[PDB]
Design a protein around this ligand. Structure first.
Ligand SMILES: Cc1cc2c3c(c1C)C(C)(C)CC=[N+]3c1c([nH]c(=O)[nH]c1=O)N2C[C@H](O)[C@H](O)[C@H](O)COP(=O)(O)O
Ligand SMILES: Cc1cc2c3c(c1C)C(C)(C)CC=[N+]3c1c([nH]c(=O)[nH]c1=O)N2C[C@H](O)[C@H](O)[C@H](O)COP(=O)(O)O
Ligand SMILES: [K+]
Ligand SMILES: [K+]
Ligand SMILES: [K+]
Ligand SMILES: [K+]
Ligand SMILES: [Mn+2]
Ligand SMILES: [Mn+2]
Lengths: 497, 496
């Protein structure tokens, strides 16, 4: 199977790309594996594969850190993400987001059932399971426990059986057979948990699949619509069905070539201290647990030589910024286009710590609408901040079509020179707010409400008569004949390539 | 000595390997400025144009990018550091500390010399033809040839006591005339208004190009009203600046200047000025505005004279490395004078010289028993009512875990610690900077408001203290683990 349909083939693709370090020396899953991963994320280095995790027994487990973080070569910066999606390692951010949105407008390709697969090579059951003895990583020194679940896919089905949701939500080892996880509104895993609580079910059938098909983990991180099963969406992205096998102990289905699967239940009643966790905004709060639902593990099935993927998230740049912000930005682009707004492109600039989305406006179509910045900013915020894909995003920046929204430097130039602070902003204090952001949960107002803005970084004339300025840069302030004369002279004169 | 002589500064750049000697003929119509602009956009070596097309009887060579950035992270500010007798590895803090060092010590008065290198050559009265000199065309949509982008205007108040040195742009306007930007609240405009008020038509004036590098830095710094830059510069340099008297008036110019224009600034005569590709990265084609006329009566110049040139615009040129960073230095000082607990200030490059980050001593802040809403309003009232605050539209207050000299730390604090709208105080009534496009070409008054203070201190920083740890390699892992990882890094196959 190709890299985008097999995690084991994806790992080999990273080896072929010279984008993976096989670490054969013993590495402690207590902080050492995550510290190496964290420093890889902070320097855009090669992904670390820990082949010799201290405490591994019977094939559980190796660790792959930084599965979807950035490469250091600017022409292949997003290459590890492109290898999730059957894209070349030179793929632009636009190419990656366009591919994730490609299934939005075409029929689902439904999964196919197979009788077995690699994930059934090994098993541990019932009283033989000891999660505290497995080498689950300690990801940050002040975390509330060992966060085994940072890059696996929760599988949970609605009571009526029609909707199977695949998503990423963190979970830590809680006990011999238990995890505690973050399960918050408005996420689909919480919506489904509430649908089971409402019919009185105490224990919901659940599975957690680690090292799924790379296309599946990307879709698991993307806010596709309510009621849409990710498996069919994944099939439409990948151009073929995902092969699923039935769980041993329940009626759920997991990818047949997953590395590791936990089968069990999600409680609708019981909670345990969950957290704290070093989180996508770059913070951990020592001692600050919150109650989270209990997952109970009844069976573990795994491949020979199983690999647990791990995201050591925090300050720039890891999977929380490369996947959560950018896939939110993709779905925000689709929301805006469905509303009839002239938005061509959306990205979550890394400088925004995945709380910003920049929206590129086709200014020719904006002028046909005969509106103004104040009215347009309100409309964009009403469309986006009332819908689930806008949940994590607190600042929308509207820029014209001379700005590359995929380039943090262009977005910052537009924001700081075209948006008059206060005057050119519309504040939203009645919308749902993201409580993980420290200015929300450790801030001056309600943790779950408000704190959002749309920043109009289009200049006044862009709404009426058009661009009346020229950039004071090499590209726009000098004739092409002068630019070419300089480029052809550059190295001969003694300037660098 | 490089901080006291522009010619010695150019030889210091040569010895740092930070200068390209360009001996091929280069056109001052857009080609010199295009090379400079690309140097500024890639942080490359300063270009010295030794062969300017149209050069006449020794006028002139051109030095581009005199205070732009070097690409090596360890010496990023080395070009600014050679203005100030600092090592090329000097931090931004070192440069700003040195510029503020003269705030708290006695001025070192300039000493007069009878002659100097600047008097080696001259052109006078009817022989002056500014239109035939190779003044650069700096941007293709500029309203004329911006001869003056890095020289020091010398103008004395009517009381005789206050001599101001300052950078303000000017373009060739005719055979003997420049037209310039002279706006409130800049001291060149304050002094022009003092002369108009007592009835003087033509104010004695000089413009010195290639001045002592310490002087051009102080020329770009909003030091207080009524303080002569010459004495401040002396106290920075730890010795007197040697001045010579102009031939045709009673003003004094650095004796080793490359080129001096002597003449008058009119209080009545106006001429079309601009547009000019400016510090925010914009030019508006066809948008000139009346500016005051400068009349040139005499030019004196060194043999092999060099005109310095700032090709300003998008990042990173002298307007970002000097205008915002020196405003931030003076904003730090103002805050400390008002008794606010500010230890450090910088103008992040991402802000396009419109942002200043202020680093708060949080131990001192907790001892004041205040809150963010109150403190943000108080800091804005102190800064946005004073001249050094003029160009700055956003102040970001950060705690003392944030390196305000590092744009990544500043954006991390701003995006994660300042709740949009809730944690911001907006200033609608203060003087605004009309050069910023969102002011001059925006939705409200060009000269009033559009400012904000962003409280990027978390709620607990005001009361009981920092209660998080960064989720980064340095703060989330014990020192024993960090060392084991750093000692293993290269051997395992990661990059240095
Ligand atoms: C890539 C990724 C996305 C995480 C994530 C992480 C990663 C690495 C972690 C594990 C490292 C930190 C935790 N994460 C959480 C999270 N969403 C959530 O509700 N709880 C979280 O704990 N997300 C986002 C979540 O996956 C997206 O919001 C999906 O759109 C949710 O799927 P749904 O739309 O089907 O609800
Ligand atoms: C380094 C530098 C600073 C410029 C400047 C430029 C540069 C290269 C240019 C030439 C490239 C673009 C023009 N500049 C102007 C300017 N201030 C001003 O009032 N008009 C301007 O035209 N400044 C800033 C000015 O020098 C500072 O605000 C000083 O504090 C003014 O001195 P003063 O405090 O004595 O008034
Ligand atoms: K999902
Ligand atoms: K605007
Ligand atoms: K000055
Ligand atoms: K705050
Ligand atoms: Mn879903
Ligand atoms: Mn002054």
């Amino acid at each position: 199977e190709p890299p985008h349909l097999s995690f084991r083939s994806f790992v080999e693709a990273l080896r072929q790309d010279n984008d993976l370090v096989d670490i054969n020396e013993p590495v402690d899953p207590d902080l050492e594996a995550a510290a190496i991963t964290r420093l890889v994320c902070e320097t855009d280095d090669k992904a670390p594969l820990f082949n010799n995790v201290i405490g591994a027994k019977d094939g559980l487990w190796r660790i792959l850190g930084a599965p979807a973080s950035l490469r250091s070569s600017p022409k292949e910066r997003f290459g590890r993400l492109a290898r999730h999606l059957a894209l070349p390692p030179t793929a632009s951010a636009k190419d990656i987001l366009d591919k994730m949105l490609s299934a939005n407008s075409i029929p689902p390709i439904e999964p196919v059932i197979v009788p077995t697969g690699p994930v059934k090579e090994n098993s541990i059951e019932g009283e033989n399971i000891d999660l505290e003895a497995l080498p689950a990583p300690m990801v940050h020194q002040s975390d509330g426990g060992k966060y085994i679940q940072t890059y696996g896919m929760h599988v949970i089905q609605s009571p009526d059986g029609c909707w199977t949701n695949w998503s990423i939500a963190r979970a830590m080892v809680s006990g011999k057979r238990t995890l505690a996880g973050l399960v918050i509104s408005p996420q689909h895993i919480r919506k489904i948990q509430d649908q089971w609580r409402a019919i009185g079910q105490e224990e919901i059938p659940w599975a957690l699949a680690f090292g799924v098909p790379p296309t599946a983990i990307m879709a698991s991180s993307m806010p596709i619509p309510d009621g849409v099963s990710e498996a069919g969406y994944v099939g439409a992205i990948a151009g073929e069905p995902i092969k699923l096998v039935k769980c041993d102990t329940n009626n759920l289905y997991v990818p047949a070539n997953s590395e590791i699967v936990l089968e069990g239940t999600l409680s609708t009643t019981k909670m345990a201290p969950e957290g704290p966790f070093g989180e996508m905004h770059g913070y951990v709060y020592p001692g600050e647990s919150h109650p989270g639902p209990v997952y109970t593990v009844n069976k573990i099935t795994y491949r020979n030589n199983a690999i647990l993927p791990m995201s050591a998230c925090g300050r720039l740049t890891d999977e929380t910024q490369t996947m959560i912000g950018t896939l939110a930005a993709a779905e925000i682009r689709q929301l805006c286009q469905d509303a009839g707004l002239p938005i061509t492109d959306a990205f979550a600039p890394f400088v925004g710590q995945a709380t910003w989305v920049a929206l590129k406006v086709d200014t020719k179509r904006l002028r046909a609408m005969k509106t103004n910045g104040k009215a347009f900013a309100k409309r964009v915020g009403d469309v986006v901040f009332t819908q689930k894909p806008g949940f994590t995003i607190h600042r929308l920046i509207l820029v014209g079509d001379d700005i590359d929204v995929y380039d943090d430097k262009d977005v910052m130039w537009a924001f700081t020179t075209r948006c008059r602070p206060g005057t050119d902003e519309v504040f939203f204090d009645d919308v749902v707010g993201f409580q993980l952001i420290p200015y929300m949960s450790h801030g001056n107002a309600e943790a779950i409400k408000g704190g959002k803005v749309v920043s109009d970084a289009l200049l006044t004339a862009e709404y009426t008569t058009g661009k009346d300025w020229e950039s004071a840069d090499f590209k726009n302030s000098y004739p092409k004949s002068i630019q070419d004369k300089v480029l052809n002279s550059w190295e001969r004169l003694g300037f660098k390539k």
